[model samples]
Structures are given as structure tokens and as C-alpha cells.
Target: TNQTYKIGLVLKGSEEPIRLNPFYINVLLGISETCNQHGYGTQTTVSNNMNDLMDEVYKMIKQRMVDAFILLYSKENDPIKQMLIDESMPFIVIGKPTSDIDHQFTHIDNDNILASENLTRHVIEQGVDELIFITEKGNFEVSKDRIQGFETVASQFNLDYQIIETSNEREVILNYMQNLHTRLKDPNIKQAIISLDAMLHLAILSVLYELNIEIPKDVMTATFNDSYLTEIASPPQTCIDIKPRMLGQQAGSAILNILKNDVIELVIIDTELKIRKSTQRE
Candidate 1:
């Protein structure tokens, strides 16, 4: 086979901010850099929505031109994943798929289960008992596992905790925080929150900042993704530092391994629970 190597990088999101997620920041860069090192080219398809995402993905499949594929994992994206599977194409996922196909495809993910538990436990140990895990509506399977992990600790410690599923819309967060603002006045109840989304984390933080809601003083804020914004927030957000670039690196390496028929298990990358001012009350 004397042809140029081309890999497809498919992701769901039209918004530039959305696409700036760690999956692309870390995984895409990792894939691109590694592939470039190996003399390969990348075909990146980023759609504004899922339908358009699939449309482009299918177009690639129809063309049958790429040497391999890499996808940012999502349930809605499973159709594309299945297509890769059915076609026996070499690929890698940036998140965990469903139980049925979890092991069927190779994926690079933070050890989210343990990392989630450790985070919840660490925050709980900081003396905040009442906790809320915030997640987006119709959250991804990875967040489901992450929720389960923290919830497991809640069960063990009998920690008063709840999972709040909400939208990232500004009004929604503002409304939720309005009611929450009232609740916090109780003073006796210490609250902590864990948001699995970067955007929602920003939304929640904005409301809290606008209301002068104190962190670690009256609230403890933590979330996923260790992005530039996290570090730059007035008070840094404590977060699960899911090194996406490392995942990307592994993704590129995994694909190369798969091509060489290297035995690789579902790649569970490590995560660091980066505690900062937001979660630590002064």
C-alpha cells in the first residue's frame, strides 16, 4: 500500500468555545502531533451539532479514504462508532462508550471513576457535608460514571449529597443560584458543588461571583477540565485535571499500536484532583 496516511478526527460541536474542549486540546493535538511525527495527515471534522457531525462522518465513511479514525465519545455519536466497528476500522475513542461496546473499541479516558470518588472524598473531608454534583441535561455516559463514583462515596460516608442535572443556559444557572442563594443564608448548611462541564462550571461561577457568594467560606466549587479559564478565574476552580493532551498522545499511540496489532486494553488514563482557591476557603 503506497498511499499517504490520513486519519479522521470527528467531534460534536459547532461553537468555537465548545470545540476548544480538552478532547480536542489534548486528544486532537496529541493525535496530530504523533501522526505528524509518523508522517501522517489528519482530516478533522467538527460540526455545530450532532446531525451535521454525523453527516460529515458518514461522508468520510462513504469515501472510505482515511487510513484510520478517532472520535470524541458521545452516545449520539455511537452510530459513527458503530460504523467504524462494523467496518472493522482502526480507531480510538476519547471517552468511554456504553457497557455493550465499552471494550469493543479502544478508548483513552481519565480514571474518572476513582478520580471522581477521590474528589468527592477530598472535598467532604474539607468539612463540607452537603454536596451537589452538577451535570448537564442528558449528560454523557462518562459523566454518568463520574456521578456514580462520587455518589458511591456519599453512600459510604452517609454524606448528604444530591446530583443536580441542569442546562448551561445563563437564565437556568441564574435561577438555580437564586434559589440556592436563599438557601445559603441558612449559614448552618455548608454547600459544595461538582460540575462535570467546563461551560456549566463557568456559568455557576459567574452567578456566584455576581452574588458575591463566597467560596470555601460559604461554598466550595469544583469541576472537570483544567483549562486556562480555570486557572484565571478570580478564585481558581478546583478540578479534575484530566490531562487531555496525554489522552491525545495515547490515542495516537494506540492507533499506531492497533495498526501493528499491539495488545492494548481500554486505556484508562490518570487524573489529578487539582485543589485550588475555589475549593479551599481562606
Candidate 2:
């Protein structure tokens, strides 16, 4: 009997055609490919909200239809992660969980702390008198780690820095730029504006360009995720290459190993920094 080990991929949102973020998509690719090779069948579940997602996962757990699950890691999914633990379910996380869950969850995630540390050091070295980090409105574990990483470097060097959280809405970002323009030109300042991830990086860059306050003239910048978009930006952005493919593959492989009781540990994958013109010192 070619009875398959069913692996369920749980993600958020069914609203958009491409509901999964870049991170989740790559992770899913790894999980799906690995499972296929191992005689495992893959399934996916997407819900509109956390509560809906939790209820659906709970139903799956009750049905005992899946042998394991791969989940997107975030504080919002704490209920789900905890439910898995309470039921002793087999699972792997795409990124680190929050503080409490870290003590118990087995996950595959990039070294965000190290990535951010390298980013802060490099941007400052490029002659930035001040640094600003921009992020979307989300309380994510990956965000926390990156913030910690940036803060660590700031403390060590005693640098001037601040973090701004805003919605991904274009108008909100543009309004933010208007205020930032006043501050950047506050009797003049050499500023380096950075982003925690690709989406925010694009948003920040877009707003800056719209205001004509950009390209190291008003503010130099960079962000996480070395996507093609970064290369095509007005002044091609420098970025951190978070190897989502490798991370997903690792999670996929880890789940297989875990099934066999071979490997049991947290994995922090490595990242690479790509330098570009946006952060170049004049």
C-alpha cells in the first residue's frame, strides 16, 4: 500500500491570488518537493483570519487526516502552535516562534539577528550620521529578532537610531515621508533609512522617490530580501539574501528526519549581504 504521510501546509489568507508571502511560498516549495520524494502527500489550508485558521487546524487535528503540519511562524498563530504542542502533534515552523514558544517549538529560520547586525554596520560605515528603520504594522517574531539585532549593533557603537512602524498603505507611507523630509532637512542630516524586509523596503523607497527625497542625496537605504525588485529600484537597493529556498528545504528535510527520530534541533540558516548604490556614501 502506497499510503502517504500527509503533510499539511497551513498559511494565512485566501483573499489574494498569491496569498502566500515570498517566505511561505519558498518554504512550501521545499516541503512539497521533499514530501513528494518521500511518498508523502501534501495538503494546504488557508483561512481569512487567525481565528478561522485556528478552527480549521483544530478540525484537521480532530480528523487525524494529516501526519504532520508545516506552519508560518508568528505571534498571531500562538494558539495553533500551542494546540499542536498540547496534542503532541508533529510540526515544523518556518521561522522562530515567540519567546514562550521558542522553548518548545522546533523550527527552521534564517539568522535575522546576524543579518540585521551586518546591515546596520554596513550602512553606518557608508557615512550615515543617523539611521532609521521602517517596518509595516505587524508584530512578528522575525521582526522582533531583526529589531534586537539592529539594537545590539546600535548599543555597541552608541549610534543614533529610531524605528518607525506604519501600514503598507501608500498614502500612509507618503505622509510619513513628508514628515521625514522635514526632519532629514532639519538643519541638514546624513540619514540612512532601512527596512526590515523587501515589501517595506520597496514602500520606503517609493515614498522617498515620490517626495524626491532619495538616493543618498536625502537618505540612503537598503533592506532584507535580495529580490529582482531590489535590483530594479531607482537606485538599486542593497539587500540581505535570506535563502528561503534553503530554509524551506531544511524544514522539509527536518520533518522527514523528525519522523524517523533522527534529528531534533532548531536550525538557524545563514544569510548573505548584497551591497548596492542606494547605501553608497557620497
Error of 2 at 214 (Å): 2.1
Candidate 1 residues 1-282, lDDT tens each?
A: 644388888786748656656546667887889888888888888677768877887777777767788877656446778777877777888777565665666777788888889888888878775888888876577778889998999889887877777888888888888877876655788778888866678888888888778776778888887888788876788888888888888888888777666455578888888888877854
How would you encode candidate 2's per-residue C-alpha lDDT over 1-282 as one tens digit per residue? 332488878775565423535655666787788888888878888687878988888888887778788885656557787788888888888777556556555778888888999999998787766788887666887788888888888778878889888887899988888877887765367888888777667777777777877586677888987867787888898999898778777877877776776345588889999998888765
What TM-score would you give candidate 2 relative to the actual structure? 0.90
Give the RMSD in angstroms, all C-alphas superposed, for model 2. Answer: 2.5
In model 1, state the lDDT of residue 275.
Answer: 84
> Pairs clashing in candidate 1?
14-48, 26-244, 26-245, 27-248
Worst window of 10 by summed lDDT in candidate 1? 16-25
* Model 2 local distance difference test score: 0.78
> Candidates' lDDT values, in order?
0.78, 0.78
After superposition, candidate 1 runs with Cα above 4 Å error: none
